[PDB]
Amino acid sequence: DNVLLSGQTLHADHSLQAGAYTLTIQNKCNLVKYQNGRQIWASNTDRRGSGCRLTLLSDGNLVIYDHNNNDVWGSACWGDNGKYALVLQKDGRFVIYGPVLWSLGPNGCRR
Amino acid sequence: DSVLLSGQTLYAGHSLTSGSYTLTIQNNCNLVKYQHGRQIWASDTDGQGSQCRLTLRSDGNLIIYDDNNMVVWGSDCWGNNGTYALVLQQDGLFVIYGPVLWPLGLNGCRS
Ligand SMILES: *[C@@H]1O[C@H](CO)[C@@H](O)[C@H](O)[C@H]1NC(C)=O
């Protein structure tokens, strides 16, 4: 419940949860991180659209999407096109992990 | 948890978990992925030491150490130094995601 692989989505009001941090993409577009329930950070895009959703792009970029797919917000950072993983940690940082480095099977090791 | 990040370590008996998948680094030193009871893959390092632990290097390398702190097994796939994340996914694959890409510090992007 605390990970979100690239191509996946956190629908409206859905959240990631790790330990005591809850990162929620609210329906009205503001991504909010709580700690035990009290807000502590937020993308400050409340009202910027509605039926909002958070998604991790295949190039590691993180973007909040409108229900009309407008790009409300975004981590504005992209690396090689591949597959990434956003993980909310038990310390509150929600991090995006570079493209895939290893995996079992035939090529599965970008070096 | 379904994530192990660089610097963390799973000791014997420990496992990541996700839905029906479970990746356990066993007392007998064998790193084994299961699906509901059934075994699907292993490093085949059973009885290759006891008290083994699975840790993820700072360079993304996945390694098994034993009783005497000797590398019993590894993935031998590493990249630049920083933080990595090994995540056991809902499709049952365990992937190790490249170095950190965006919250570099506050809001930093490795280019
Ligand atoms: C990879 O290296 C430095 C020293 O080699 C270490 O302090 C750091 O934890 C590492 N990764 C990062 C960026 O934390």
Contact B16, B85 (CB under 8 A): no
Cα distance between residue A21 and residue A96, in whole Å = 16
Cα distance between residue A98 and residue A31, in whole Å = 21
Residue B12 CA, chain-centre distance (Å), reads 13
3-class secondary-structure state, position A55: strand
Locate tokens 């190790």: which residue?
Answer: B96
Cα distance between residue B82 and residue B96, in whole Å = 13
Question: Apex CA A12: angle with CA A100 and CA A31, to 5°?
Answer: 70
CATH at B61: 2.90.10.10
- Please list every residue in chain A followed by a chain break, i.e. its C lies more than 2.5 Å from the next written N: none
Listed resolution, Å: 2.8
Cα distance between residue B24 and residue A62, in whole Å = 31
Contact B67, B85 (CB under 8 A): no
Cα distance between residue B93 and residue B77, in whole Å = 17
Which has the closest alpha carbon to A30: A55, A11, A49, A16?
A49
Which residues of chain B are within 8 Å of residue A4 when distances are taken between CB atoms? none
Number of domains in chain A: 1
3-class secondary-structure state, position A21: strand
Q: What residue numbers bound the domain in which B99 lies?
A: 1-111
Q: Number of Cβ pairs closer than 8 Å across A and B?
A: 101
Question: Which of A8, A102, A103, A109 is best to mutate for the B interface (most B CBs within 10 A)?
Answer: A102
CATH at A54: 2.90.10.10
Number of domains in chain B: 1
Residues in chain B: 111
**Beta-bridge mates of residue B41:** B33
Q: How many CB atoms are located within 10 Å of the residue A111 CB?
A: 9
Asked if A102 lies within 8 A of B2 by C-beta distance, the reply is no
Residue B36 CA, chain-centre distance (Å), reads 19
Question: Apex CA B102: angle with CA B97 and CA B104, to 5°?
Answer: 110
What separation in angstroms does the CA of A78 have from each of A60, A61, A63, A99? 5, 5, 11, 10
